[PDB]
Protein backbone atom coordinates (compact mmCIF):
# COMPACT_ATOMS: atom_id res chain seq x y z
CA UNK A 1 0.00 0.00 0.00
CA UNK A 2 3.09 2.23 0.11
CA UNK A 3 3.50 2.69 -3.64
CA UNK A 4 -0.27 2.83 -4.09
CA UNK A 5 -0.54 5.43 -1.33
CA UNK A 6 1.77 7.72 -3.27
CA UNK A 7 -0.36 7.45 -6.41
CA UNK A 8 -3.31 8.26 -4.19
CA UNK A 9 -1.85 11.44 -2.71
CA UNK A 10 -0.78 12.47 -6.21
CA UNK A 11 -4.32 12.11 -7.58
CA UNK A 12 -5.62 14.24 -4.71
CA UNK A 13 -2.94 16.86 -5.39
CA UNK A 14 -3.88 16.99 -9.07
CA UNK A 15 -7.52 17.07 -8.03
CA UNK A 16 -7.03 20.02 -5.69
CA UNK A 17 -5.30 21.96 -8.47
CA UNK A 18 -8.16 21.13 -10.84
CA UNK A 19 -10.78 22.37 -8.37
CA UNK A 20 -8.72 25.55 -8.07
CA UNK A 21 -8.25 26.31 -11.78
CA UNK A 22 -11.30 25.06 -13.69
CA UNK A 23 -13.92 25.74 -11.00
CA UNK B 1 -6.10 -26.74 -32.86
CA UNK B 2 -5.59 -28.81 -29.71
CA UNK B 3 -7.13 -27.90 -26.35
CA UNK B 4 -7.15 -24.31 -25.11
CA UNK B 5 -5.65 -23.19 -21.82
CA UNK B 6 -8.36 -21.28 -19.91
CA UNK B 7 -7.93 -17.62 -18.97
CA UNK B 8 -6.95 -16.83 -15.36
CA UNK B 9 -9.72 -16.99 -12.74
CA UNK B 10 6.71 -4.07 -21.35
CA UNK B 11 4.24 -1.57 -22.82
CA UNK B 12 5.83 -1.10 -26.24
CA UNK B 13 3.31 -2.19 -28.87
CA UNK B 14 6.10 -3.45 -31.13
CA UNK B 15 7.03 -6.08 -28.54
CA UNK B 16 3.73 -7.70 -29.55
CA UNK B 17 4.01 -7.43 -33.35
CA UNK B 18 7.10 -9.49 -34.19
CA UNK B 19 5.52 -12.41 -36.05
CA UNK B 20 2.94 -12.39 -38.84
CA UNK B 21 0.56 -14.17 -36.47
CA UNK B 22 0.89 -11.23 -34.08
CA UNK B 23 0.10 -8.72 -36.83
CA UNK B 24 -2.96 -10.57 -38.13
CA UNK B 25 -4.24 -11.24 -34.60
CA UNK B 26 -3.82 -7.55 -33.83
CA UNK B 27 -5.85 -6.74 -36.94
CA UNK B 28 -8.64 -9.20 -36.10
CA UNK B 29 -8.93 -8.08 -32.48
CA UNK B 30 -8.97 -4.41 -33.46
CA UNK B 31 -11.64 -5.13 -36.07
CA UNK B 32 -13.88 -6.84 -33.52
CA UNK B 33 -13.32 -4.12 -30.92
CA UNK B 34 -13.82 -1.20 -33.31
CA UNK B 35 -16.96 -2.78 -34.76
CA UNK B 36 -18.46 -3.28 -31.30
CA UNK B 37 -17.49 0.19 -30.08
CA UNK B 38 -18.94 1.98 -33.12
CA UNK B 39 -22.15 -0.04 -32.86
CA UNK B 40 -22.35 0.77 -29.16
CA UNK B 41 -21.96 4.51 -29.65
CA UNK B 42 -24.49 4.40 -32.49
CA UNK B 43 -27.07 3.08 -30.03
CA UNK B 44 -26.24 5.36 -27.11
CA UNK B 45 -29.10 7.77 -26.23
CA UNK B 46 -28.67 11.50 -26.89
CA UNK B 47 -28.30 11.89 -23.13
CA UNK B 48 -25.34 9.54 -22.70
CA UNK B 49 -23.57 11.20 -25.62
CA UNK B 50 -23.76 14.56 -23.84
CA UNK B 51 -22.18 13.04 -20.75
CA UNK B 52 -19.46 11.67 -23.03
CA UNK B 53 -18.95 15.16 -24.47
CA UNK B 54 -18.55 16.58 -20.96
CA UNK B 55 -16.10 13.88 -19.90
CA UNK B 56 -14.26 14.31 -23.20
CA UNK B 57 -13.76 18.01 -22.53
CA UNK B 58 -12.64 17.85 -18.90
CA UNK B 59 -10.47 14.73 -19.08
CA UNK B 60 -8.76 15.76 -22.32
CA UNK B 61 -7.81 18.96 -20.50
CA UNK B 62 -6.41 16.99 -17.55
CA UNK B 63 -4.49 14.68 -19.89
CA UNK B 64 -2.69 17.62 -21.50
CA UNK B 65 -2.37 19.86 -18.45
CA UNK B 66 -1.09 17.08 -16.19
CA UNK B 67 0.71 14.87 -18.70
CA UNK B 68 3.90 14.84 -16.62
CA UNK B 69 1.91 13.83 -13.55
CA UNK B 70 0.17 10.97 -15.36
CA UNK B 71 3.57 9.59 -16.35
CA UNK B 72 4.97 10.10 -12.85
CA UNK B 73 2.05 8.23 -11.26
CA UNK B 74 2.37 5.44 -13.81
CA UNK B 75 5.99 5.04 -12.74
CA UNK B 76 5.07 5.11 -9.06
CA UNK B 77 2.64 2.28 -9.80
CA UNK B 78 4.80 0.08 -12.04
CA UNK B 79 7.67 0.17 -9.55
CA UNK B 80 6.13 -3.01 -8.17
CA UNK B 81 3.48 -5.42 -9.45
CA UNK B 82 -0.05 -4.46 -8.43
CA UNK B 83 -3.49 -5.91 -9.15
CA UNK B 84 -6.62 -4.20 -10.48
CA UNK B 85 -8.09 -4.54 -7.00
CA UNK B 86 -5.13 -2.69 -5.48
CA UNK B 87 -5.63 0.45 -7.56
CA UNK B 88 -9.40 0.14 -7.21
CA UNK B 89 -9.20 -0.07 -3.41
CA UNK B 90 -6.87 2.93 -3.37
CA UNK B 91 -9.19 5.02 -5.54
CA UNK B 92 -12.09 3.95 -3.31
CA UNK B 93 -10.40 5.11 -0.10
CA UNK B 94 -9.71 8.57 -1.54
CA UNK B 95 -13.17 9.23 -2.93
CA UNK B 96 -14.50 8.29 0.53
CA UNK B 97 -12.91 11.26 2.33
CA UNK B 98 -12.57 13.52 -0.73
CA UNK B 99 -15.72 14.81 -2.43
CA UNK B 100 -14.15 17.15 -4.98
CA UNK B 101 -14.64 16.88 -8.73
CA UNK B 102 -10.95 17.24 -9.56
CA UNK B 103 -9.75 14.02 -7.95
CA UNK B 104 -12.40 12.10 -9.89
CA UNK B 105 -11.48 13.63 -13.25
CA UNK B 106 -7.82 12.97 -12.41
CA UNK B 107 -8.58 9.33 -11.63
CA UNK B 108 -10.43 8.86 -14.93
CA UNK B 109 -7.44 10.33 -16.75
CA UNK B 110 -5.01 8.10 -14.87
CA UNK B 111 -6.93 4.82 -15.24
CA UNK B 112 -7.30 5.73 -18.93
CA UNK B 113 -3.52 6.07 -19.07
CA UNK B 114 -2.98 2.65 -17.48
CA UNK B 115 -5.38 1.36 -20.11
CA UNK B 116 -3.20 2.68 -22.91
CA UNK B 117 -0.07 1.19 -21.31
CA UNK B 118 -1.66 -2.19 -20.64
CA UNK B 119 -1.28 -4.78 -23.41
CA UNK B 120 -3.70 -7.30 -21.90
CA UNK B 121 -7.15 -6.63 -23.45
CA UNK B 122 -9.15 -8.61 -20.87
CA UNK B 123 -7.46 -7.12 -17.80
CA UNK B 124 -7.78 -3.64 -19.32
CA UNK B 125 -11.55 -3.82 -19.81
CA UNK B 126 -11.85 -5.42 -16.37
CA UNK B 127 -10.07 -2.38 -14.95
CA UNK B 128 -12.23 0.08 -16.91
CA UNK B 129 -15.42 -1.69 -15.84
CA UNK B 130 -14.46 -1.97 -12.17
CA UNK B 131 -12.95 1.50 -11.73
CA UNK B 132 -15.80 3.20 -13.62
CA UNK B 133 -18.17 1.91 -10.95
CA UNK B 134 -15.90 3.23 -8.20
CA UNK B 135 -15.43 6.65 -9.81
CA UNK B 136 -19.13 7.21 -10.51
CA UNK B 137 -20.21 7.49 -6.87
CA UNK B 138 -23.15 9.68 -5.82
CA UNK B 139 -20.83 12.67 -5.51
CA UNK B 140 -19.60 12.33 -9.09
CA UNK B 141 -22.93 11.84 -10.86
CA UNK B 142 -24.17 14.96 -9.06
CA UNK B 143 -21.33 16.99 -10.59
CA UNK B 144 -21.98 15.62 -14.08
CA UNK B 145 -25.78 16.04 -14.18
CA UNK B 146 -25.46 19.66 -13.02
CA UNK B 147 -22.96 20.64 -15.72
CA UNK B 148 -25.24 19.04 -18.32
CA UNK C 1 -32.26 -8.67 -22.74
CA UNK C 2 -30.15 -7.44 -25.66
CA UNK C 3 -31.12 -3.76 -25.92
CA UNK C 4 -28.77 -1.05 -24.62
CA UNK C 5 -31.62 1.23 -23.50
CA UNK C 6 -32.75 -1.44 -21.03
CA UNK C 7 -29.50 -1.12 -19.08
CA UNK C 8 -29.44 2.69 -19.14
CA UNK C 9 -32.00 3.25 -16.38
CA UNK C 10 -30.65 5.51 -13.64
CA UNK C 11 -28.51 8.62 -14.01
CA UNK C 12 -25.60 6.59 -12.61
CA UNK C 13 -25.87 4.07 -15.45
CA UNK C 14 -25.69 6.92 -17.97
CA UNK C 15 -22.57 8.42 -16.40
CA UNK C 16 -20.92 5.02 -15.96
CA UNK C 17 -21.59 4.30 -19.63
CA UNK C 18 -20.06 7.64 -20.59
CA UNK C 19 -16.97 7.02 -18.45
CA UNK C 20 -16.55 3.45 -19.68
CA UNK C 21 -16.91 4.55 -23.31
CA UNK C 22 -14.38 7.34 -22.82
CA UNK C 23 -11.73 4.98 -21.46
CA UNK C 24 -12.37 2.37 -24.16
CA UNK C 25 -12.53 4.97 -26.94
CA UNK C 26 -9.32 6.62 -25.75
CA UNK C 27 -7.50 3.28 -25.66
CA UNK C 28 -8.67 2.02 -29.03
CA UNK C 29 -7.65 5.29 -30.69
CA UNK C 30 -4.27 5.32 -29.00
CA UNK C 31 -3.81 1.70 -30.03
CA UNK C 32 -4.57 2.39 -33.69
CA UNK C 33 -2.32 5.44 -33.54
CA UNK C 34 0.65 3.21 -32.69
CA UNK C 35 -0.10 0.41 -35.15
CA UNK C 36 2.52 0.04 -37.93
CA UNK C 37 1.60 0.39 -41.62
CA UNK C 38 1.63 -3.41 -41.83
CA UNK C 39 -1.04 -3.95 -39.19
CA UNK C 40 -3.18 -1.13 -40.59
CA UNK C 41 -3.26 -2.74 -44.03
CA UNK C 42 -4.27 -6.05 -42.46
CA UNK C 43 -7.12 -4.21 -40.74
CA UNK C 44 -8.23 -2.81 -44.11
CA UNK C 45 -8.14 -6.33 -45.55
CA UNK C 46 -10.34 -7.69 -42.76
CA UNK C 47 -12.63 -4.66 -43.02
CA UNK C 48 -13.29 -5.31 -46.70
CA UNK C 49 -13.53 -9.10 -46.58
CA UNK C 50 -15.69 -9.45 -43.46
CA UNK C 51 -18.02 -6.54 -44.21
CA UNK C 52 -18.69 -8.17 -47.58
CA UNK C 53 -19.46 -11.39 -45.70
CA UNK C 54 -21.77 -9.52 -43.31
CA UNK C 55 -23.79 -8.32 -46.30
CA UNK C 56 -23.62 -11.37 -48.57
CA UNK C 57 -24.81 -13.56 -45.68
CA UNK C 58 -26.82 -11.26 -43.41
CA UNK C 59 -29.56 -13.89 -43.40
CA UNK C 60 -27.34 -16.79 -42.38
CA UNK C 61 -25.69 -14.61 -39.72
CA UNK C 62 -29.05 -13.95 -38.05
CA UNK C 63 -29.92 -17.63 -38.40
CA UNK C 64 -26.72 -18.62 -36.62
CA UNK C 65 -27.45 -16.09 -33.87
CA UNK C 66 -30.97 -17.43 -33.26
CA UNK C 67 -29.42 -20.91 -33.16
CA UNK C 68 -26.98 -19.85 -30.45
CA UNK C 69 -29.55 -17.71 -28.63
CA UNK C 70 -31.56 -20.90 -28.01
CA UNK C 71 -29.70 -21.72 -24.80
CA UNK C 72 -27.08 -19.87 -22.76
CA UNK C 73 -23.44 -20.58 -23.64
CA UNK C 74 -20.07 -19.49 -22.27
CA UNK C 75 -17.10 -17.98 -24.07
CA UNK C 76 -15.44 -21.42 -23.95
CA UNK C 77 -18.43 -23.21 -25.48
CA UNK C 78 -18.17 -21.04 -28.59
CA UNK C 79 -14.36 -20.93 -28.72
CA UNK C 80 -14.17 -24.72 -28.48
CA UNK C 81 -16.71 -25.27 -31.25
CA UNK C 82 -14.88 -22.91 -33.60
CA UNK C 83 -11.64 -24.64 -32.60
CA UNK C 84 -13.09 -28.04 -33.54
CA UNK C 85 -14.42 -26.87 -36.92
CA UNK C 86 -11.24 -25.01 -37.92
CA UNK C 87 -9.13 -28.08 -37.07
CA UNK C 88 -10.71 -30.11 -39.87
CA UNK C 89 -11.72 -27.24 -42.16
CA UNK C 90 -8.78 -25.33 -43.67
CA UNK C 91 -10.50 -22.95 -46.11
CA UNK C 92 -10.39 -19.16 -45.87
CA UNK C 93 -14.17 -18.89 -45.98
CA UNK C 94 -15.02 -20.46 -42.63
CA UNK C 95 -12.47 -18.18 -40.98
CA UNK C 96 -13.89 -15.00 -42.52
CA UNK C 97 -17.39 -16.20 -41.65
CA UNK C 98 -16.40 -16.81 -38.02
CA UNK C 99 -14.88 -13.33 -37.61
CA UNK C 100 -18.14 -11.86 -38.89
CA UNK C 101 -20.31 -14.06 -36.67
CA UNK C 102 -18.25 -13.50 -33.51
CA UNK C 103 -18.21 -9.79 -34.30
CA UNK C 104 -22.01 -9.92 -34.42
CA UNK C 105 -22.27 -11.82 -31.12
CA UNK C 106 -20.10 -9.10 -29.59
CA UNK C 107 -22.60 -6.46 -30.65
CA UNK C 108 -25.51 -8.34 -29.02
CA UNK C 109 -23.63 -9.09 -25.80
CA UNK C 110 -24.15 -6.48 -23.08
CA UNK C 111 -21.22 -7.57 -20.89
CA UNK C 112 -17.98 -5.71 -21.76
CA UNK C 113 -15.64 -8.11 -19.94
CA UNK C 114 -17.18 -11.31 -21.33
CA UNK C 115 -17.23 -9.75 -24.80
CA UNK C 116 -13.52 -8.90 -24.83
CA UNK C 117 -12.79 -12.36 -23.43
CA UNK C 118 -14.57 -13.79 -26.47
CA UNK C 119 -12.75 -11.51 -28.92
CA UNK C 120 -9.40 -12.29 -27.29
CA UNK C 121 -10.00 -16.02 -27.10
CA UNK C 122 -11.60 -16.41 -30.55
CA UNK C 123 -9.08 -14.20 -32.36
CA UNK C 124 -6.40 -16.67 -31.26
CA UNK C 125 -8.38 -19.68 -32.48
CA UNK C 126 -9.15 -18.09 -35.85
CA UNK C 127 -5.64 -16.79 -36.52
CA UNK C 128 -4.13 -20.23 -37.07
CA UNK C 129 -1.32 -20.91 -39.54
CA UNK C 130 -3.43 -21.33 -42.67
CA UNK C 131 -5.36 -18.10 -42.03
CA UNK C 132 -2.19 -16.03 -41.67
CA UNK C 133 -0.98 -17.66 -44.89
CA UNK C 134 -4.10 -16.38 -46.69
CA UNK C 135 -3.89 -12.83 -45.34
CA UNK C 136 -0.15 -12.39 -45.96
CA UNK C 137 -0.52 -13.75 -49.51
CA UNK C 138 -3.34 -11.37 -50.52
CA UNK C 139 -0.97 -8.44 -49.90
CA UNK D 1 -23.97 -28.05 -27.12
CA UNK D 2 -26.29 -29.46 -29.79
CA UNK D 3 -27.07 -25.89 -30.85
CA UNK D 4 -23.36 -25.09 -30.73
CA UNK D 5 -22.89 -28.00 -33.13
CA UNK D 6 -25.47 -26.50 -35.49
CA UNK D 7 -23.78 -23.09 -35.44
CA UNK D 8 -20.51 -24.82 -36.28
CA UNK D 9 -21.83 -26.58 -39.37
CA UNK D 10 -23.35 -23.32 -40.65
CA UNK D 11 -20.01 -21.50 -40.46
CA UNK D 12 -18.44 -24.33 -42.46
CA UNK D 13 -21.32 -24.30 -44.95
CA UNK D 14 -21.10 -20.52 -45.34
CA UNK D 15 -17.32 -20.84 -45.49
CA UNK D 16 -17.43 -23.49 -48.22
CA UNK D 17 -19.68 -21.14 -50.21
CA UNK D 18 -17.29 -18.20 -49.79
CA UNK D 19 -14.43 -20.35 -51.09
CA UNK D 20 -16.47 -21.41 -54.12
CA UNK D 21 -17.64 -17.92 -55.09
CA UNK D 22 -14.11 -16.57 -54.70
CA UNK D 23 -11.19 -18.05 -56.65
CL1 LIG E 1 -13.18 6.29 -37.35
CL1 LIG F 1 -14.14 8.93 -35.01
Author numbering:
A (entry chain B), D (entry chain D): 68 to 90
B (entry chain A): 46 to 54, 63 to 201
C (entry chain C): 63 to 201
Q: What is the paper's account of this structure, in its own sentences?
A:
The B-cell lymphoma 2 (Bcl-2) protein family is a key mediator for maintaining cell survival or to drive apoptosis, thereby removing infected, damaged or unwanted cells, and sequence, structural and functional orthologs of Bcl-2 have been found in a number of poxviruses. As observed previously for VV F1L,22, 23 VAR F1L adopts a Bcl-2-like fold that forms a domain-swapped Bcl-2 with similar binding grooves that engage BH3-domain ligands.
To investigate the molecular basis for Bid, Bak and Bax BH3 domain binding by VAR F1L, we determined crystal structures of VAR F1L in complex with Bak and Bid BH3 domain peptides. Similarly, VAR F1L bound Bax and Bak BH3 domains weakly with KD values of 920 and 2640 nM, respectively. In the VAR F1L:Bak BH3 complex, residues V75, L78, I81, I85 protrude into four pockets in the VAR F1L-binding groove, similar to the equivalent hydrophobic residues in Bid (I86, L90, V93, M97). Superimposition of bound Bak and Bid BH3 backbones indicate that both ligands are bound in near identical manner. Superimposition of VV F1L with VAR F1L from their respective complexes with Bak BH3 yields a root-mean-square deviation of 0.9 Å over 138 Cα atoms, with the only notable differences in side chain orientations between VV F1L and VAR F1L occurring at F135. Overall, the VV F1L and VAR_F1L complexes with Bak appear to be near identical. Similar to endogenous mammalian pro-survival Bcl-2, VAR F1L is able to prevent both Bak- and Bax-induced yeast death, indicating that VAR F1L is able to directly engage both Bak and Bax. Unexpectedly, VAR F1L was unable to protect both wild-type and Bax−/− mouse embryonic fibroblasts (MEFs), whereas Bak−/− MEFs were efficiently protected from apoptosis in a manner similar to Bcl-2, suggesting that VAR F1L exclusively inhibits Bax-mediated apoptosis. Among the other alternatively proposed mechanisms invoked to control apoptosis, VAR F1L's ability to inhibit apoptosis is most readily explained by an indirect model based on sequestration of Bax and Bak,39, 40 where Bax and Bak are held in an inactive configuration by a pro-survival Bcl-2 family member.
